[PDB]
């Protein structure tokens, strides 16, 4: 029957959607934070040069040892170059007396900036205190 073709098309569209979801939530990476001031467990972008790639999925505590375990789903295009020398930092809308930078963070909430290098492989990183100079 020709009308039996519609559920097959719906099923293959759903399969493409499953593939798209598996690509978008590519792989889970665990980062240790000293203080996650405004990381929402539902929506928190992880950007490289401002381009959103990763997304924070899980937040937990390392049995109250002053460390926050943040699990982030990262896409495959960044997973292909995710190496051991990958640095993360928390961009917050800090407005102290010494520095008032962070207007983008104030506008768009809190997010995670990333920078890769030339390491081998790692899945468990520790976030830096501030944004390092990268040239």
């Amino acid at each position: 029957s020709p009308f039996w073709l519609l559920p097959f098309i719906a099923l293959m569209i759903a399969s493409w959607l499953i593939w798209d979801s598996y690509q978008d939530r590519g792989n889970t990476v665990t980062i240790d934070f000293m203080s996650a001031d405004g990381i929402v467990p539902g929506r928190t972008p992880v950007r490289y040069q401002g381009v959103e790639v990763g997304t924070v999925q899980d937040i937990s505590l390392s049995d109250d040892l002053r460390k926050i375990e943040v699990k982030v789903s990262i896409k495959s295009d960044m997973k292909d170059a995710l190496r051991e020398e990958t640095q993360f930092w928390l961009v917050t809308p800090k407005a102290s007396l010494a520095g008032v930078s962070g207007l983008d963070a104030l506008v768009g909430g809190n997010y995670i900036g990333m920078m890769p290098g030339k390491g081998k492989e790692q899945d468990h990183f520790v976030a830096l205190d501030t944004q390092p100079k990268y040239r």
Partner: protein, 392 residues
């Protein structure tokens, strides 16, 4: 003079029917026939005044919204155009067909019938389209949607009734009364008269297109219309199962993928149906209840009812036949109202359209939701209750 029920194959003599009340099947109590009421000239007059009223009921703004010191005028055309420009052309087209295109097809069909009477052109498929267009002409649903959206955005901004709202309400009333007093079997018998039978033959078939009971000709087609006349549908069970499986598959993306993306102060919310209904229950639960029961309660109830009916067909169960038909009728009556969410999100994205402070957009799940609603409506319409009756 004598007919056979299209739902349970009850062969019964039909007495003469006046304008008051109508007739029903003796066994299953199903609406079979209507009589007298309005005439084709009155239908043409209603179509003409609808043609006069529709452009000014569509282009003119429904209501004026003052949000953040900005006055915004929005309407159905603006909402559908925003839907198409965003990238969801299929959702825009299905919303357009449900709201605006269907009355246009109704008016065009009435004019086509009148000109066919005037000239002598064929008028067979137009009557079938007119019969099956009543399930798709939905303006009261859009009225309920604009009411729900107005109540939802009453706290966000200031809402004032526009000039176009009155014309839209008048159009809704006119379409409601015309569709309630539009009779299709009377039109069929007026345009192509036929003859009754001897009240007892046990060899008459009922056409599912024109509700005519009789003998097929030498070509196997209905005497009244040029479609084949069979005992049941050709592949009723296969079509129902295919549409039910398609709706079951497509329901999962409609709830998993986000349905509404709200850009507030530069940050996007990206919330699905469950998150939206939870927030609406937290804030304005009074309308969250009706939104819930019209968005997620109706589709899953229809899905499980159709699945249990097909399982009963396969199992040949003969226990709750008196209640399965009632459940099927209730599902047929209630499945049309599942399109409320698309109209609500269309109006809200047409109204709340600030550049960055408050930007409401429809995400990549309303397409799957609307496709699932259309597919389950088609499954319910394609299910044949004569198979349920023959399962005994």
């Amino acid at each position: 003079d004598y007919q056979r029920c299209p739902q349970c194959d009850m062969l019964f003599s039909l007495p003469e029917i006046n304008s008051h009340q109508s007739a029903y099947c003796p066994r299953c109590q199903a609406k079979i026939r209507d009589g007298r009421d309005w005439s084709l000239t009155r239908l043409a007059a209603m179509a003409f005044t609808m043609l006069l009223l529709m452009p000014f009921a569509w282009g003119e703004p429904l209501l004026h919204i003052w949000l953040l010191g900005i006055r915004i005028d929005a309407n159905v055309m603006q909402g559908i155009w925003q839907m198409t420009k965003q990238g969801d052309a299929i959702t825009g087209s299905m919303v357009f067909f449900c709201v605006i295109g269907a009355p246009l097809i109704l008016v065009t069909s009435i004019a086509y019938l009148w000109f066919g009477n005037r000239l002598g052109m064929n008028l067979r498929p137009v009557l079938l389209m007119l019969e099956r267009l009543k399930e798709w002409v939905m303006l009261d649903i859009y009225l309920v949607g604009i009411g729900v959206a107005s109540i939802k955005v009453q706290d966000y901004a200031h809402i004032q009734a526009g000039v176009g709202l009155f014309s839209f309400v008048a159009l809704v009333i006119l379409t409601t009364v015309t569709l309630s007093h539009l009779n299709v079997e009377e039109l069929w018998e007026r345009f192509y008269p036929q003859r009754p039978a001897t009240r007892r033959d046990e060899k008459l078939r009922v056409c599912l297109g024109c509700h005519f009971t009789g003998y097929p000709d030498q070509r196997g087609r209905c005497p009244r219309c040029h479609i084949p006349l069979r005992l049941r549908r050709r592949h009723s069970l296969q079509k129902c199962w295919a549409a039910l499986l398609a709706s079951i598959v497509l329901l999962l993306p409609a709830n998993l993928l986000p349905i509404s993306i709200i850009y507030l102060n530069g940050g996007r919310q990206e919330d699905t149906i469950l998150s939206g209904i939870m927030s609406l229950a937290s804030s304005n639960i009074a309308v969250a209840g009706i939104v819930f029961i019209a968005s997620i309660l109706v589709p899953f109830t229809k899905v499980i009812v159709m699945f249990t009916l097909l399982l009963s067909i396969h199992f040949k169960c003969q226990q709750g036949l008196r209640t399965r038909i009632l459940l099927l009728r209730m599902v047929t009556w209630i499945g049309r109202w599942s399109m409320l969410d698309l109209f609500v999100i269309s109006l809200t994205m047409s109204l709340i359209n600030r550049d960055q402070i408050l930007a409401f957009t429809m995400g990549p799940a309303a397409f799957y939701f609307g496709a699932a609603v259309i597919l389950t409506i088609l499954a319910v319409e394609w299910l044949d209750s004569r198979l349920l009756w023959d399962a005994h």
